[PDB]
Design a protein around this motif. Sequence first.
Motif, mmCIF file in Angstrom:
data_model
loop_
_atom_site.group_PDB
_atom_site.id
_atom_site.type_symbol
_atom_site.label_atom_id
_atom_site.label_comp_id
_atom_site.label_asym_id
_atom_site.label_seq_id
_atom_site.Cartn_x
_atom_site.Cartn_y
_atom_site.Cartn_z
ATOM 1 N N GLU A 94 0.515 -1.169 0.005
ATOM 2 C CA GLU A 94 0.099 -0.100 0.062
ATOM 3 C C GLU A 94 0.967 1.191 0.002
ATOM 4 O O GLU A 94 0.693 2.059 -0.828
ATOM 5 C CB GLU A 94 -0.830 -0.053 1.134
ATOM 6 N N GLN A 138 3.532 1.236 -3.158
ATOM 7 C CA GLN A 138 2.815 1.743 -4.298
ATOM 8 C C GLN A 138 2.059 2.957 -4.310
ATOM 9 O O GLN A 138 1.029 3.157 -4.750
ATOM 10 C CB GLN A 138 1.649 0.756 -5.072
ATOM 11 N N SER A 169 3.029 5.806 -6.431
ATOM 12 C CA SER A 169 2.256 6.525 -7.341
ATOM 13 C C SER A 169 2.190 7.943 -7.001
ATOM 14 O O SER A 169 1.616 8.741 -7.452
ATOM 15 C CB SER A 169 0.785 5.927 -6.892
ATOM 16 N N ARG A 204 4.701 8.934 -9.989
ATOM 17 C CA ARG A 204 3.958 8.843 -11.121
ATOM 18 C C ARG A 204 3.567 10.173 -11.498
ATOM 19 O O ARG A 204 3.787 10.389 -12.878
ATOM 20 C CB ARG A 204 2.613 7.897 -10.717
ATOM 21 N N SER A 205 3.034 10.970 -10.657
ATOM 22 C CA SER A 205 2.826 12.240 -10.944
ATOM 23 C C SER A 205 4.016 13.332 -11.230
ATOM 24 O O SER A 205 4.587 13.031 -11.968
ATOM 25 C CB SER A 205 1.766 12.905 -10.050
ATOM 26 N N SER A 217 -5.086 10.799 -7.642
ATOM 27 C CA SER A 217 -3.823 11.264 -8.385
ATOM 28 C C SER A 217 -3.572 10.865 -9.625
ATOM 29 O O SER A 217 -4.068 10.093 -10.197
ATOM 30 C CB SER A 217 -2.553 10.407 -7.616
ATOM 31 N N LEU A 218 -2.930 12.202 -10.466
ATOM 32 C CA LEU A 218 -2.846 12.051 -11.633
ATOM 33 C C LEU A 218 -1.648 11.709 -12.383
ATOM 34 O O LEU A 218 -0.521 12.521 -12.418
ATOM 35 C CB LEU A 218 -3.532 13.435 -12.225
ATOM 36 N N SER A 219 -1.554 10.569 -13.076
ATOM 37 C CA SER A 219 -0.386 10.353 -13.865
ATOM 38 C C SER A 219 -0.742 9.834 -15.240
ATOM 39 O O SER A 219 -1.745 9.118 -15.489
ATOM 40 C CB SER A 219 0.294 9.230 -13.099
ATOM 41 N N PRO A 220 0.159 10.457 -16.261
ATOM 42 C CA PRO A 220 -0.024 10.150 -17.555
ATOM 43 C C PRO A 220 -0.257 8.632 -17.962
ATOM 44 O O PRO A 220 0.212 7.667 -17.169
ATOM 45 C CB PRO A 220 1.473 10.585 -18.197
ATOM 46 N N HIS A 256 -5.622 7.564 -9.921
ATOM 47 C CA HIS A 256 -5.317 6.665 -8.790
ATOM 48 C C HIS A 256 -6.185 7.105 -7.908
ATOM 49 O O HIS A 256 -6.335 8.246 -7.344
ATOM 50 C CB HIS A 256 -3.678 6.756 -8.506
#
Lengths: 68, 496, 136
Positions: free
Chosen positions: A55, A58, A62, A65-66, B340-343, B389
């Motif tokens: 959790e 990731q 995550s 990721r952004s 959350s925002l990822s491409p 996400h």
Amino acid sequence: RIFRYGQAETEDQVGVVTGLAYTTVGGDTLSIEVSLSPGKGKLILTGKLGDVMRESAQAAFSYVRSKT
Amino acid sequence: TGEVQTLTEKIEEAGMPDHVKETALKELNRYEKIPSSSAESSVIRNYIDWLVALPWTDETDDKLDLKEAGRLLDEEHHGLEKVKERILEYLAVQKLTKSLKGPILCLAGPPGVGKTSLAKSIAKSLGRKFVRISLGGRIIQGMKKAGKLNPVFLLDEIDKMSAMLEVLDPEQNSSFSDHYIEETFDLSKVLFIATANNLATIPGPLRDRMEIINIAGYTEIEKLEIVKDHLLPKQIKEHGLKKSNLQLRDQAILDIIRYYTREAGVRSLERQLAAICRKAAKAIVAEERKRITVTEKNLQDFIGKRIFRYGQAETEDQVGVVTGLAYTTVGGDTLSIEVSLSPGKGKLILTGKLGDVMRESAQAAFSYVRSKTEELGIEPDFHEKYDIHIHVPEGAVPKDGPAAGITMATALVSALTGRAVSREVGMTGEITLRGRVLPIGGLKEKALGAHRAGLTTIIAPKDNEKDIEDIPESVREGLTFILASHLDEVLEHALV
Amino acid sequence: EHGLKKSNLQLRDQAILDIIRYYTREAGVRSLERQLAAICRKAAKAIVAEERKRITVTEKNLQDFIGKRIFRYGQAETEDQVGVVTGLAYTTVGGDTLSIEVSLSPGKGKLILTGKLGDVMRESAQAAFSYVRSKT
Ligand SMILES: Nc1ncnc2c1ncn2[C@@H]1O[C@H](COP(=O)(O)OP(=O)(O)O)[C@@H](O)[C@H]1O
């Protein structure tokens, strides 16, 4: 001498942080590591099987990721 | 002489009437007093004694005077008005049906609301003896610990279990068996009561064999009074010292609550009281000062520093982050959903509870924004070139999973449009593809706990209004209930 | 079963009806039994205190026994919607009224459906679909 104390020996590393953790036997200094091998977005982690960890993992994941 | 009489004598005693047993009695009795206390002569030796105490006729003249009882409940529990009105129904009904009937009740609610105590008190009224029997993992014992066959068993926890029916089945409970003692037994007059939290783990079979009562939790107001008229005195008296020894001003009690307890019950409350009852005493013995007055400034000098944040006095508004009111097995709670925002691709992966129940809802608040887009201010080329996400913290109970629709929605938008959820607002509501807001479960507990963490606005389903009626005065008074039927309604009030 | 007399409590027909329409939407009568007992209970507490040898629950009394109304039974509040139909379905527990919804978002002819994963459904879906494809 039996244990080292301080940085008269160690020298900075990569993808390797020293987290302070709460052991049943006090403060301890467990080091987390990360390694990069070609492949897919999947991430497999070692050590404690940890379902609690994924959790979090990731999530730091995550995050990057952004804000890239 | 020989101890061939010490026992035998008290055996034929008035005690031990039923003959179905006396057989097995004198049987293993006229056994082998021959010879001495061999390794054998120590065995059955004891088997007889456990058998001597077990009751057979000691019935406790059940006094059933409502005029009292009902107002003995008001001596040892504060509110619980509606819950009492239903304990008495279970007696006025009892009196008539001279023989206790199958439906035996479970008390259900967050821990620390009084389930255990109500029972003890039900029995205080009936003047039957009381026994806790914990089921965290055997009634065998039960009676022994009360050598009077007319008791009150409290099957404390029936839900921290990994089948027993036999013991309660109105038809069967009469004739009761048990290995390692095999012999029928009558449990006719035995008031059974059950405690419980997550009504799930309970076996469908049982939950039907039993009639249910919900204890609810408490308004700041309520807790406060519970503290003053019951909690405190009890702790004073228990840490042996005088009422004249220590007093806490109302405002501090409040503070203790808002800032050192976020529970629905009052257990954490009791513990912090004692903290003081204790600190108090050490004074009364050393300093000897006959009085100790804890105030809204003193508080820290007793129970430590503040422990929970209460109110958005502290906090600043966030993005793609909404605060949904959820129904925890332990009351209203304030779990925050994040996005959350990822491409990437239209795919959306969510974290926290694996939730197969969630995806349906998620990919529906999702499938909403899919439609009404430009209308909302967000680049329509998104579900095509972004990857979303979502995090939905565990706690909400099954039935209430879908009650997070308007929440994830709100977040997903506030996240896509760079806007920001108003930290003050807590929301709950089920979503549909079209953007409809369907009815939600337990608005009461939800707003109750919404108030506890001190929020201002609490957006909920429109079709839920007839549910605001029963929300206790005190809390309905500190909340502005924004009711809604479609997302846009929610979105307008929860974003800025 | 709540030990008391037939002469102790009577409910007028219309109320029974109401109990049903408004506090039970089941096909059996279990929920119905429960709400009855609710009253058998409430009833008794009177017969012991007040002692009144009779209690007559009526279509107006009902709230003073079993709470407020619990289900809707009509189309008063509910008003007409779009792309949203009410299909009668056969649940393991009787007739039910599940509502199907459809939403329109820009894109490709593809159609993704939610709820029951349904491989059985797609066939049908992409047929009502494949109908409108024609007669347009
Ligand atoms: N309404 C109430 N009035 C008085 N004391 C209460 C009340 N609710 C909880 N308590 C506290 O808890 C006891 C009864 O509640 P308790 O049985 O501890 O809750 P639970 O049984 O649900 O854990 C009381 O003796 C006191 O410790």
